[PDB]
Amino acid sequence: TTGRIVAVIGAVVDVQFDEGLPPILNALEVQGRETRLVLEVAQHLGESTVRTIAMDGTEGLVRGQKVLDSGAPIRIPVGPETLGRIMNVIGEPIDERGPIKTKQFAAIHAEAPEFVEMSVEQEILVTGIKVVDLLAPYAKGGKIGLFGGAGVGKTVLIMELINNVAKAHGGYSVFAGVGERTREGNDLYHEMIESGVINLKDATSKVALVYGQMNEPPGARARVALTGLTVAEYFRDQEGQDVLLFIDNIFRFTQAGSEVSALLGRIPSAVGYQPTLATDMGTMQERITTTKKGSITSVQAIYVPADDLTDPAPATTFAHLDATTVLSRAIAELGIYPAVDPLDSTSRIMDPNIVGSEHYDVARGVQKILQDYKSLQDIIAILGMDELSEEDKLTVSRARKIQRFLSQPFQVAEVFTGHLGKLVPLKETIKGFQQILAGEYDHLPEQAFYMVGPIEEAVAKADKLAE
Template sequence: MDDEPVIYGDLGLVSLAELAFDVVAQTREVAEPTLEMREMGRVTYVGEGIARVSGLPTVQAEELVRFENGRLGMALNLDAAEVGVVLLDEREDLDAGSKVHRTGRILDVPVGDSLLGRVVDAIGRPIDRRGAIRADMHRPVEREAPAIMDRAPVDTPMQTGLKVVDALIPIGRGQRELILGDRQTGKTAVALDTILNQRETDVYCVYCAIGQRNAAVASVISDLQEHDAMAYTTVVVAGGDEPPGLQFVAPYAATTIAEFYMEAGRDVLIVYDDLTRHARAYRELSLLLRRPPGREAYPGDIFYIHSRLLERATHLDDDHGGGSLTALPVVETEAQNLSAYIPTNLISITDGQIYLSPTLFQKGILPAVDVGRSVSRVGGKAQMPAYRQMAGDLRLSYAQFEELEDFARFGTRLDEDTQRTLQHGRRVREVLKQSQYDPMPVAEQVAVLFATTNGLLDGLDIAQIPEAESRIRLAVRDDVPEICAQIEEGQSLDDAARAALLRVARAAVQSITMNHEAGDGDA
């Protein structure tokens, strides 16, 4: 038998068969792409906002899946026979039988300074027509809340610029303060003024619109731009015409964006507007995915979806950067029913609530904060000392006034003390009024409220109160700037400082009286 032909080379004898095998193997290595095993499933049912998929046995909870038309979804229900997928895009061109692929990625969102000033959707895609976002990193939208031992006490105020809030319902950095009330009572206005008041501070802001009309969201963005607030603000939008999956994911994505700054040692304010619509979106998804309904058709874990969201707001200790995340969730009530299901859930999760009354709103008392039904369980410890020196008297006099005002409606003859209390209370209420987009600096707030609690405005007509307030604010800035600096630095006011404030405020009020008398004399 003839020997097999061989080729002589420097490395020894190599058979032609072995050489041919090596050449073919090398050619395949260069010419053919690496094959990758991917799970593929098929859609068995498509509903309004959800799809059911079979054939993805190892898919993870909250994993992104991609349909053959390029649309995205998130695996939410992991049943034995099928997977319940929440659609994150419109269901156009998606039918039963369509192919579905795993991506291997848990739903995440871009984070970083590149998102400042941008408007994005619930999964971080830009919707402001300003080009792509160049983010250095992505983080999962669902993250564990910081451990209890990693947190520090709330000890720094989050100034809203609203007198009634900063003096009577103070908020601290790292606190969760609920804003609730009926429709059209100014809930968004309170949150928006708080964002605008951070313009001269080191606080970053995230505004999350959930289920809102596009026109309403556009109005908020326009206001932020007009008042130069977009430079330190990110807006996350899941509009009312978006799939319910995006509305459900939006607040978690916004919190992940905010946590990036908190973990970098910065202070952040986040507004969820509003969690009533968030709860409705989750109820819709749950019912479509055939989860058992509970009270008012909400699933049993409706409390958990909000608690795991709001628990991420906190103040970290110095070992973890010392940053803070302050949450202002908004919730809508119906017919002033604070004891409804979702509002009571959120009241029990948060650290206090600011209640906006439709009755006060209709009377033109804006912001329409009902002081009697509002409370802050944390912020008082973080309140500036200058506020604490007069907030107690202010709250007491206002509460007495509200009780007497109701009583006085049934009687015609009132003693002098009651009349004085009513007159003083009406001026307190007038001082607590404030126009939107006009947040007031701390020192000016303290000066005006200090003058009010000491009765300097009791001799003026109600119509003269706004002018008196303006003059006091101007006089304090011009005449006692050192006391203003002392207040803003968080120092207590000694007797000399209080006397100086009273002197300046009294002179401002007297100038109104003198001008009024001079005007009467000329007439």
């Protein structure tokens, strides 16, 4: 079947087919372009005309240009031949390393796993991050989400998690860069090559890349997420291997949709977001899950518009996670990095019958003292201080030390912390905080914990801070 473009406005193009109207979700190959421009059928307006979203620029298109129906949705190459290869939204090799020689391709659009395919196994994934492992530990094969505003450390944290987990990972991994800074992409690409995670010579690459940065049209950003997902889905099912799915930033999926929304003739919903926000997010997120075939530990960086966590985008994302690490700008401003908010992060495995009673007690105890201090803050805000009882002045001091003991110098942010990267094992994490709660280290200055590793480094630093 062959259609012709009849209207072009933005990334939304309408094509009229003489015969054989292509079903929705199908791709269309715009004929007459030096660049492969794919159009995804989104609506069937009628009068043998269909509305499509462009996966690239519509600039240059002319009304009447012939378009061919591929006869199937956007298919991309999946398999081990993608590892170490940077893939385009529509599966094209944008790494310059020739074509991706895969035996079979896969459609990016698929159905979500049935209810009788989910798992109920929860295992703690020691990422090596104090705040995380202590308060909100991740689950090996559980959906994870890093929330935060523009400038809190989401990207740096996801990179850190990659450094730790992705490297010492038995299996393949996939990284999809949805609407972000290409700069970051180039950096990550070269950094992984250095860490041998991506070998440009011998086949030892484990991380497969997919990108569609902020320089791409709404259509590309709205699908790159699915593209990367499909890649991970293959390794999950037809391979039965542990797949790591890192997405940054997933919010761009929703943003891309709101842009074309108006051009698709939809009535604005709350905060001007598309009325199909939830469903669109659901059809996608639900595919990003662990099945009885394979496990996928997904780590997604979720942007928070104007830091308003009540914004329909991040607000709807919360219900699609098992572990939430909310980043606060306030804590970031204080200087505590990662800027994880200890009173807004939670984990599904934080049950005393999963992470253990001792761990649960320590985590809760830390959260409590912090909350208590938070309540004492506004109390003395502009009312002196010398009135609080020994207990209050004790909780304040301890809470502050714990607060500053949450900051851990990240290897990734070494050029931002001006310190060496440290990793603290869960055991030492529980140990240290448990001891601080016990008030054992109440004879050390607050700064002795500010940006350190194990409690040993805090004590040693304390004595070192003789002057």
